[PDB]
């Protein structure tokens, strides 16, 4: 039943009933607290539900399970950038590039965070990395 509720949340996410999908992922979490897919999907659903403070907590719980997901770190960078922790998001985008230096999106989004944070030289070096990848 742990997997079935995850498939239920995926189906509900296809019908834009996101709040109903979040309840499905949470039920699979109660059944198995170590299901990293349930945590990662819950973070991406709450991100679109704009529960950004709760969304980052599920993304951190997903990274705590599988600490080598460039998708989870990059998605945590989107939430923390929209939430307001620009320096904590740049540290999250950094861990995403440590795992995959070919992620053209993570390098482009890190240059945007650094450009708003101050260091144009650190941002420019990140912009050129993303441009060379694609």
């Amino acid at each position: 039943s742990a997997l079935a509720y995850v498939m239920l949340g995926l189906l509900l996410s296809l019908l834009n009933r996101l709040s109903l999908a979040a309840e499905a992922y949470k039920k699979a979490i109660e059944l198995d607290p170590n299901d990293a897919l349930a945590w990662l999907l819950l973070g991406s659903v709450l991100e679109k539900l704009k529960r950004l403070d709760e969304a980052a907590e599920a993304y951190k719980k997903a990274i705590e399970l599988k600490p080598n997901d460039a998708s989870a770190w990059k998605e945590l960078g989107k939430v923390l950038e929209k939430l307001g922790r620009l320096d904590e998001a740049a540290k999250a985008y950094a861990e995403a590039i440590k795992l995959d230096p070919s992620d053209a999106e993570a390098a482009k989004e890190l240059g945007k965070v650094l450009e708003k944070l101050g260091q144009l030289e650190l941002a420019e070096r990140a912009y050129q990395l993303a441009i060379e990848l694609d």
């Binding site: 740049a90 950094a94 590039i97 440590k98 230096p101 070919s102 390098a107 650094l114 260091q119 650190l122 070096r125 990140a126 050129q128 990395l129 060379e132 990848l133």
Partner: protein
């Protein structure tokens, strides 16, 4: 050997600071940024104490060594401090004998073909190309013919715009110093993860 460790991490942090506490901060940021080869130059006052105070990073998987060694008596304090490799900007034959007997890896400074031959006769096949901003990657690609065994780790003129030119020429690693040293102890960690990414992306 140390060569296989140079071939893996492919980057050496030529750390130059002013105080002892300033050096320990930048070494922590560089290691957190993914760079495991840290070259602590002896121009830093009391560099033999910085190397022995960073001994805990050798458990975390860091290779701390002493760089810019002018005299052999300076290499005495370098080996006794706990450095795992000795680096000099010039070729000093008496330092090579001391590092061979004590069992420490030594990378001399070479700029000419004759300085390379004299360093090869001492048994060295891994030389430091100082200053790389004068010889250029064309030098490394030129010595690939007559000396197919020498492996260069340049120090000068190695920036992010041409870091792939050095590697595609035939270098073993690169020693970035000015780019990694400049910045706050949090900008230094970010500068490392950006430099490690470009090296991994080179063809």
């Amino acid at each position: 050997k140390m060569e296989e460790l140079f071939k893996k991490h492919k980057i050496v942090a030529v750390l130059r600071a002013n105080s002892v506490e300033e050096a320990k901060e930048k070494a922590l940021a560089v290691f957190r940024g993914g760079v495991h080869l840290i070259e602590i130059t002896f121009t830093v006052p009391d560099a033999d104490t910085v190397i022995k105070e960073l001994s805990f990073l050798k458990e975390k998987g860091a290779i701390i060594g002493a760089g810019t060694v002018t005299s052999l008596e300076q290499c005495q304090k370098a080996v006794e401090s706990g450095a795992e490799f000795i680096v000099s900007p010039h070729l000093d034959p008496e330092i090579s004998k001391f590092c061979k007997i004590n069992g420490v890896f030594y990378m001399p400074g070479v700029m000419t073909p004759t300085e390379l031959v004299k360093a090869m006769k001492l048994g060295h096949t891994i030389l430091k190309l100082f200053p790389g901003e004068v010889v250029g990657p064309q030098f490394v690609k030129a010595m690939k013919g007559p000396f197919p065994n020498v492996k260069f780790v340049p120090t000068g003129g190695v920036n992010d715009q041409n870091v792939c030119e050095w590697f595609k020429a035939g270098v073993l690693a690169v020693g970035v110093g000015s780019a990694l040293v400049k910045g706050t102890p949090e900008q230094v960690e970010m500068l490392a993860v950006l430099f490690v990414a470009k090296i991994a992306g080179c063809t």
